[PDB]
C-alpha cells in the first residue's frame, strides 16, 4: 500500500475505502485519509505501549482484554475518551472506600 512510502504502519487505502463505503461525503481530500490513519496509528501505538508495559508488570508476555481495559482506565485522557463505552470482559479498577475499612 501507500503507507510504506508515508511512514505509517496502518495502510491508508483501507481508511480510504472505509470512508467511501459509508458515503459520509461526496468527496474527501487526499490529506484526510492519511491524517486519519496517522491519528489512529498514534492512538493505537500509545495504547499498545501502555498494554505491553502492563503485561510486563505481571511478568507476562500475552495480553488479554483485561490488560487493555486496565491500560485504558489507568490514564485520564483515555478514560475520558472511553467514558460511557463498555468493553467486554473489562471490569473496573479496584477501589475500596475508607469508611468501609475496619478501625
Amino acid at each position: 500500500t501507500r503507507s510504506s512510502r508515508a511512514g505509517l504502519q496502518f495502510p491508508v487505502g483501507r481508511v480510504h475505502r472505509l470512508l467511501r463505503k459509508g458515503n459520509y461525503s461526496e468527496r474527501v481530500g487526499a490529506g484526510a485519509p492519511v491524517y486519519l490513519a496517522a491519528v489512529l496509528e498514534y492512538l493505537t501505538a500509545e495504547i499498545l505501549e501502555l498494554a505491553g508495559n502492563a503485561a510486563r508488570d505481571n511478568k507476562k508476555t500475552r495480553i488479554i482484554p483485561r490488560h487493555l481495559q486496565l491500560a485504558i482506565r489507568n490514564d485520564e485522557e483515555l478514560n475520558k475518551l472511553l467514558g460511557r463505552v463498555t468493553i467486554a470482559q473489562g471490569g473496573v479498577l479496584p477501589n475500596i472506600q475508607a469508611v468501609l475499612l475496619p478501625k
Partner: protein, 97 residues
C-alpha cells in the same frame, strides 16, 4: 472462626475487583432474557455471544450503579445501602425523571 464484621466483605471486594470470573451464571440469566423477549415473539434464538454481551453490559452498568449507590450511602455516613440510596444514584445521572 468468627472474624470482625466487614473485613471479609472488603476482602471479597478486593478479590473480585481483580478477577475476571463471571459473577452471574449464564443459565438463569439466559432464561430470564428469553422470557423477557418472549413477551412479543416466541421461540427467539439468542447467540452465546449475544448472551455474553448482555451479561457483560448488565454487570458493568449495575456495578457502576452500586459504586454510585455506595458513594451516596457513604455521603450520608452509612455503609449498608438503602432504596433511597439507589433512587438518588439513579436520579443523579438523569435517567430517572
Amino acid at each position: 472462626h468468627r472474624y470482625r464484621p466487614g473485613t471479609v466483605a472488603l476482602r471479597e471486594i478486593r478479590r473480585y475487583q481483580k478477577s475476571t470470573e463471571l459473577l452471574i451464571r449464564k443459565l438463569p440469566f439466559q432464561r430470564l432474557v428469553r422470557e423477557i423477549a418472549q413477551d412479543f415473539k416466541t421461540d427467539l434464538r439468542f447467540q452465546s455471544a449475544a448472551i455474553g454481551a448482555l451479561q457483560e453490559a448488565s454487570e458493568a452498568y449495575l456495578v457502576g450503579l452500586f459504586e454510585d449507590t455506595n458513594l451516596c450511602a457513604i455521603h450520608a455516613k452509612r455503609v449498608t445501602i438503602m432504596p433511597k440510596d439507589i433512587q438518588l444514584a439513579r436520579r443523579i445521572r438523569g435517567e430517572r425523571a
